[PDB]
């Protein structure tokens, strides 16, 4: 709980509204936020109801120049951005600057796949939803509302998980070597009465 320049949030298993509210409060506090893996955000309510909610959202359009009408964004990252910006005073310079401090992406791009990704417990579905309750996935609602990049993200995420697993195995082996040398070192038992 210390002020970092950039917080990378792995949005897997989170709730859209709860994560948006927490992020919107951090941006007004003046913190750069990168919400990666937005195709895994969870929304309460069963999938058919959520798709009806979204398909009702498409209905809002101008009767003159739908080019000026409401802009319906189908990407899961843009869905999260719409949720976040609705919780911000974006009509003012403060809120407009706050939006510039948020980077919502699909998947985990290489500039952010090699950085620690914290999670928000106040938005996690496992901790915040009663078991036995129906929910949906934004990355699934997006595919059946118009989003057309689901397959590429899934493929590029399988590659990323494979590479990350290889990296962790190498780091775990090095950590095992360091861990083995730990008790071999003597001061770790000689004067460890301080609790370390």
């Amino acid at each position: 709980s210390e002020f970092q320049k950039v917080v990378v949030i792995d949005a897997k298993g989170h709730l859209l509204g709860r994560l948006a509210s927490v992020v919107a409060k951090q941006l007004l506090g003046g913190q750069k936020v990168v919400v990666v893996r937005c195709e895994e955000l969870n929304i309460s309510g069963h999938f058919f109801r959520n798709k009806l909610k979204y398909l009702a959202y498409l209905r809002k359009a101008c009767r003159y120049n739908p080019s000026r009408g409401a802009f319906h964004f189908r990407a899961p990252s843009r869905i999260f951005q719409k949720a976040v910006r609705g919780m911000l005073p974006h009509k003012t310079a403060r809120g407009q600057a706050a939006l510039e401090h948020l980077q919502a992406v699909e998947g985990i791009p290489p500039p952010f796949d090699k950085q620690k990704r914290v999670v928000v417990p106040a938005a996690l579905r496992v901790l915040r939803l009663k078991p036995g309750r129906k929910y949906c996935t934004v990355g699934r609602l997006s595919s059946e509302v118009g989003w057309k990049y689901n397959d590429i993200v899934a493929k590029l995420e399988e590659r990323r998980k494979v590479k990350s697993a290889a990296f962790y195995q190498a780091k775990l082996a090095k950590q095992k070597k360091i861990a083995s040398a730990k008790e071999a070192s003597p001061v770790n038992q000689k004067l460890s009465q301080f609790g370390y």
Binding site: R49, L52, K53, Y54, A56, Y57
Partner: peptide, 30 residues
């Protein structure tokens, strides 16, 4: 999204008219 056909929010004449005519209903049943 509202996801409704009829808005759940009410106009000020409409909300005021309830207390106008709900009281009269109690007057009538009295």
């Amino acid at each position: 999204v509202s996801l409704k056909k009829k808005s759940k929010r009410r106009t000020t004449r409409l909300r005021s008219r309830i207390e106008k005519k709900a009281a009269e209903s109690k007057r009538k049943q009295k």
